[PDB]
Ligand binder design. Sequence first.
Ligand SMILES: Nc1ncnc2c1ncn2[C@@H]1O[C@H](COP(=O)(O)OP(=O)(O)OP(=O)(O)O)[C@@H](O)[C@H]1O
Ligand SMILES: [Mg+2]
Lengths: 50, 469, 40
Amino acid sequence: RFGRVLDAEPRLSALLSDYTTPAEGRVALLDKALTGRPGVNQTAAALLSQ
Amino acid sequence: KTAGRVVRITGPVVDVEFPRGSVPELFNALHAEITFGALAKTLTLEVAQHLGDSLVRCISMQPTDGLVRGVEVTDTGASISVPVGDGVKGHVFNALGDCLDDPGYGKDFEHWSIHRKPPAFSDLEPRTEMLETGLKVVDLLTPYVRGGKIALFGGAGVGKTVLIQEMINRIARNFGGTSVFAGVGERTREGNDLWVELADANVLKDTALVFGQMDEPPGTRMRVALSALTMAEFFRDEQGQDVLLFIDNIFRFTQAGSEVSTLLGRMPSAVGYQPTLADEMGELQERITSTRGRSITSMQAVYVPADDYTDPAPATTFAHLDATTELSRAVFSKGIFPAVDPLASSSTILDPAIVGDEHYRVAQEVIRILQRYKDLQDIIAILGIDELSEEDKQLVNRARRIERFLSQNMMAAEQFTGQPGSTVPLKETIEAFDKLTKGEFDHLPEQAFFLIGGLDDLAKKAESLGAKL
Amino acid sequence: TISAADIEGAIEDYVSSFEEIGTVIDAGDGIAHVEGLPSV
Ligand SMILES: Nc1ncnc2c1ncn2[C@@H]1O[C@H](COP(=O)(O)OP(=O)(O)OP(=O)(O)O)[C@@H](O)[C@H]1O
Ligand SMILES: [Mg+2]
């Protein structure tokens, strides 16, 4: 599902797909946008974040 | 949204990154914005390559000075299009279709993409109807084809543009169809002169002018020919009207292609030209063509760099022509106008089947005499004429008279010399050169044959010199 | 399960969280290469 939603939003992936910015910032962005949601599985969340 | 952003700028070439699934198709037009004060404008980029990673390399039509990395780039969703219809006649356009003599004109017209395939092979039919110009050398040795393709080759300053003007006067003036002039990488003041001249001669109302001149980026200089050819194609395929298409200069289209190829990172071919030189030239040229029942007479001036006729550009251009006038530096040096090289020029319709037996015989005899004179030049440069045999001396005198008589006072030459031009009927030309080849004028002085029309002019000038015809 | 609007609420916040000086990275024979100056 995360793959599908990232595919739907290519611009979100492109913003997340740069290492020119600190890792913690993009991890926080991912948490706020997609991963940090009521139903997201904890293990999937941690895996995607790392 | 779905707009790309500029990632790389290398002069006219721009790399643009798009979101996945929004990569524009090849040749699509894209719009960017330069916001710097004096250079503020909208750039039109033509997609040229897909680089992968949702990147497209594009050729800018306007200078990219002032463009910034990361600026939004919008995809028009189509290719560059130009206005078409009867409305284009009488107006001046640029490569992008903008009207110059009246901005905003033609925005409501039907617009045609400047990119299209050539006519299907099954619709092609060879053309062999002679086009009489009234120039002795052209009518005799390189008869032009109505509905065919004619070219004028020549180095710097040998008279290509003046001959194009001459042919506009001799053909487009009393022409029932439409005319399209495509200035391609030539002098801008020449475009202004042509505009004013066509207005004065009242031919402008039947002519559409498209100019992408020297001070333009290579993208514009390689697409302006397509734009003008698109207007000509509309007139050929939609109104069924005979079309004249003058192009000056097509070598500049090839040169702009070479510059773009260098910027696009393509590996250079021989003499630094683009690897796709012949392919680009063929894609352009095969569109310039008559079809069954639809006539385009096209006349293209081809620049020869450094007088080198073996340069790849003209070398590949040669194959796309029905008639080829070759202007020579040596003939120009002798003062012979038009400075046509009668031995290197050719016409596909100069055979006894088309032009008749006597026309062919006279042309072949003239060519033989001039070829023998060319052969004897090696001896003559050292020892002069007096070491030759009597036969060769007579032939050399005849050849010098013939080469002088192939010159002519052109209509477009009046502005230079003040002398009005002359028109020679084809029958009179054949009769006169038959008489020359048989030595009926050998007694007249050589200068009697220089820059004149028919036999009456020959008699008058010979009398003024002192010899009676 | 996906709002598709909270995505904006987070990405705009991230981007908003972000004179220009470049640095010569290499130089030779009348040519120089500069890193930085994103707005040049
Ligand atoms: N028929 C002619 N009679 C007299 N002078 C001529 C004639 N044709 C050309 N010239 C002279 O040669 C000059 C160059 O002519 P023209 O501009 O037609 O050459 P071109 O081959 O198009 O040159 P370029 O390579 O600069 O575009 C003219 O300005 C004029 O000086
Ligand atoms: Mg010229």
